[PDB]
Design a protein around this ligand. Structure first.
Ligand SMILES: CCCCc1cc(=O)oc2c(O)c(O)ccc12
Ligand SMILES: CCCCc1cc(=O)oc2c(O)c(O)ccc12
Lengths: 513, 513
């Protein structure tokens, strides 16, 4: 037994990557390819499904080739895992194998009207109507409403449903389909948990809802766990089956945010993760029993290692403008030029001294869904510099995440144990300190940042016996991959003063329509 | 009929100038000398009267020495005019001919307590109790309270009162005293209007107010008009009688703002001036009858040509943060560097696209009155840029002016005829365009921008026959000096939405204490 290897396809909003991990959980090869962000109308975003599948195959054969020149005794990958951008919905044909049309992406707003009609004509105007089934409000994000929009507005996709050809799938299903050659038509529970068609507690499709929303269940794939035989890679798109050499199983499929949870060893209830990027998603493991939300937050599947494995559930909240706020201060406002000046400028001052900046540029998410909320700054005087604004933008992210976490503590009935953080903005020391102070917990910053991709590789390693227990996983991690830990430090009437200010700033934010 | 020349001493907060004008109303010589800003305690400001007097003298003889070197037709100054920082109060002794202490400046805060005590005990808690007599509210600015402060806190002044050698005087009075060698103890109507001791209906000192604030009337100079024989220069302090050569009468005397009103030719009722400086002072001529405000605006004297000539009254409004908001965006927020960029960045976008920036850094003055209001921005999206923010600051300035003008029109019972503009921000044509479009009158931008100095030069030259009427003053300006006219150029519907957004934004500015 020499060095075994597990591959992860990371199919994100703006690019696709393939990372190869070894049995020590180290990324040893990686390759990235971008895809086009088609915006036909304002607020619309579409991806081209064949560009994504193509990107993924290019990623695999370049990653393989590169590893095979740093380890010339590398004959095979044990298994492939997939993690992907969730909610993004593809429509394809049973026999022609091709996309009927482009894939509306998770944050697309073409499903606006369909979202209105549904809440009214099915929920009696209550957005939470189906939420004890799914765990979700009715929104433009989820996969069913996109399914609905295409069936309605796309000649080709209408006919495909008519003829009994039509397949529908999130990006995990699509990738697993095209990688197979048509063989497997499958999804994992976490991904399925975002369709608006799956029962959260049972992890089975709801025939109530599919029929209530007129989606022919012929179009839907078979649900499985995150960690088991899904299919085999055997397409020849960019030499990919050739490059792998042996028949390679796909034994790993898991949505992106939950992959970051799993990748961060957030296995026990209480353990939570935050992924900074353009925005934030926070997910907390809540345990083997599903918890529902009185604050807006989503309930979703955290993970499920194996067919009839214990299924852990989670709560989920988002902030829309996290790293976008920093990048906005830079490129839109000229408040600094170089990425590190941001942090240095915020430190250069002691407080925000009066000011609050609430960066609700595209609305308020979290536990106050106000899409009339806009970007706002209150309390300025002639003493206000860009440093205070910069510092206040970071305080505001951390304050939203506080409001978010507090809403989870009540919904979940337990504390936040600790908080793992990954992404651009977690390299910011000051934000991590402010974040810790307000939550009063440890913030663990992993120095192997590649944890979204690691998630899917863990799934497929467990299912294929590269590791065997979630404990060996925890132990290999602890040994191999270090982490910076940042503790809370500060007062209680600082914390409560900062929030009292925040509460008052939030009243002043309502503006659009 | 040889060339005639009028001189204007322009004694400001931070410096003194002497500008000599020719009969074409052209500035032909200038010299500027600054004086020391004495700050004994935070909030306090004080000027040395003797340093101020010498400055004026230096300015005169230097500017005269320069002119006779560059103009062979300059033989003499026909008359001298004075324009001055108002409200600044000088306590001197009629036998030593010298000050008993330094002079507290208009914006000095050491009179605050005295001011609160006058409001409570003389006004029953009403700061406006004397506003139908004086045109003014109880405030730190006004002369009477500085006079009162100096009796109560300055032994030398209190002694001088007792001994009956005390002269109180605004800077017009101090300058005409010392230029006389102590022979003239006069003030002009406009400066008297800022003492809190003059009755606007009579333009005479109010026996009741003198009695109630306990300033004896023997301390006070004689009230005369803006344009008449005050005195003659007969000091040789810094060579100034030597430089003037012939006997030179002092025949003009007018407070700085009113001077600008008059240098801007606002002789008829409904004609207004606005100075776009660090802040904004807008004065409108309301005609021969005083008008009082229901919106916190000051009623004041505008001008009076001739001993007991017709007396034109004004309303006065201020905005605190004009050029200061421009300076803040550059200095504190790094939105631009070179001053030309402010206008170019604001022109580079076609509107503000929903944002509003209320630059209420030091509160709202003007016709809303909120010391709690702070600098606020609302409505930002990820499309918002420094360009939109800069343009909104400019809109904001014009919007407050619009409101101030609005109030004046209601209080005065008249329309705004035209707006003459001056100060540095008047060279920002986009601001002048936005302002025309908002008020829907023409804005007149004089190219000879020395409007404060010219006021005093016109008063003095009228009295000495250099110009024989206001019609002749107006005609020489047209012929000799260009005015750029700037016309309303947007839509009434855009006008209205800007005002609606402005009114919404104001509701979100309350922050402080
Ligand atoms: C307008 C309702 C949006 C629902 C939403 C809330 C949230 O806190 O996180 C989300 C989220 O993480 C998604 O991927 C999609 C939708 C939401
Ligand atoms: C503290 C109240 C100030 C009154 C005031 C109102 C205004 O509109 O303009 C003023 C002004 O232009 C002054 O020079 C002094 C006081 C005011």
């Amino acid at each position: 037994a020499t060095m075994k290897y597990v591959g992860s396809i990371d199919q994100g909003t703006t690019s696709t990557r393939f990372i190869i991990f070894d049995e020590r959980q180290r990324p040893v090869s990686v390759h990235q390819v971008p895809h086009t962000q088609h915006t036909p109308h304002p607020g619309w975003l579409e991806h081209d499904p064949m560009e994504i599948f193509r990107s993924a195959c290019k990623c695999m054969s370049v990653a393989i080739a590169k590893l095979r020149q740093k380890d010339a005794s590398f004959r095979k990958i044990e298994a492939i895992g997939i993690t992907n951008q969730r909610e993004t919905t593809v429509a394809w044909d049973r026999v022609t194998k091709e996309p009927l049309c482009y894939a509306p992406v998770w944050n697309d707003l073409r499903t606006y009207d369909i979202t209105k009609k549904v809440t009214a004509e099915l929920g009696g105007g209550d957005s939470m109507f189906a939420s004890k089934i799914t765990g979700l409000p009715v929104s433009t994000y989820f996969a069913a409403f996109k399914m609905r929009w295409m069936l309605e507005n796309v000649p080709a996709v209408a006919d495909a449903c008519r003829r009994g050809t039509l397949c529908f799938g999130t990006i995990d299903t699509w990738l697993m389909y095209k990688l197979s050659g048509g063989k497997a038509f499958v999804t994992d529970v976490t991904n399925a948990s975002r369709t608006f068609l799956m029962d959260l507690r049972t992890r089975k499709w709801s025939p109530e809802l599919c029929e209530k929303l007129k989606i022919p269940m012929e179009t839907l794939p078979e649900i499985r766990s995150n960690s088991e035989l899904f299919g085999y890679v055997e397409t020849d798109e960019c030499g990919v089956a050739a490059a792998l050499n042996e028949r390679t199983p796909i034994m790993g499929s898991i949505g992106d945010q939950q992959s970051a949870l799993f990748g961060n060893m957030c296995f026990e209830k209480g353990e939570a993760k935050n992924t900074y990027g353009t925005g934030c998603f926070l997910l907390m493991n809540v345990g083997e029993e599903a918890r529902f939300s009185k604050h807006g937050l989503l309930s979703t599947v955290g993970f499920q290692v194996g067919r009839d494995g214990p299924c852990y559930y989670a709560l989920e909240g988002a902030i829309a403008c996290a790293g976008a706020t920093v990048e906005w201060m830079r490129r839109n406002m000229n408040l600094f030029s170089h990425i590190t000046e941001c942090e240095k400028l915020a430190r250069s001052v002691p407080g925000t001294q009066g000011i609050v900046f609430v960066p609700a540029f595209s609305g308020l998410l979290a536990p106050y869904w106000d899409p009339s909320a806009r970007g706002t700054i209150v309390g300025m005087t002639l003493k206000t510099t860009r440093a205070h604004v910069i510092r206040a933008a970071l305080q505001a992210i951390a304050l939203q995440l506080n409001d978010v976490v507090g809403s989870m503590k009540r919904d979940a009935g337990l504390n936040l144990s600790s908080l793992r953080v990954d992404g651009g903005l977690s390299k910011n020391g000051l934000l991590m300190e402010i974040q810790a102070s307000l939550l009063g917990v440890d913030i663990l910053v992993p120095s192997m940042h590649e944890t979204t991709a690691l998630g899917a590789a863990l799934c497929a390693g467990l299912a294929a016996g590269v590791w065997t227990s979630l404990e060996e996983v925890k132990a290999v991690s602890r040994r191999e991959n270090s982490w910076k830990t940042v503790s809370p430090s500060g007062s209680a009437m600082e914390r409560e003063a900062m929030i009292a200010e925040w509460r008052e700033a939030l009243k002043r934010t309502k503006w659009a329509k």
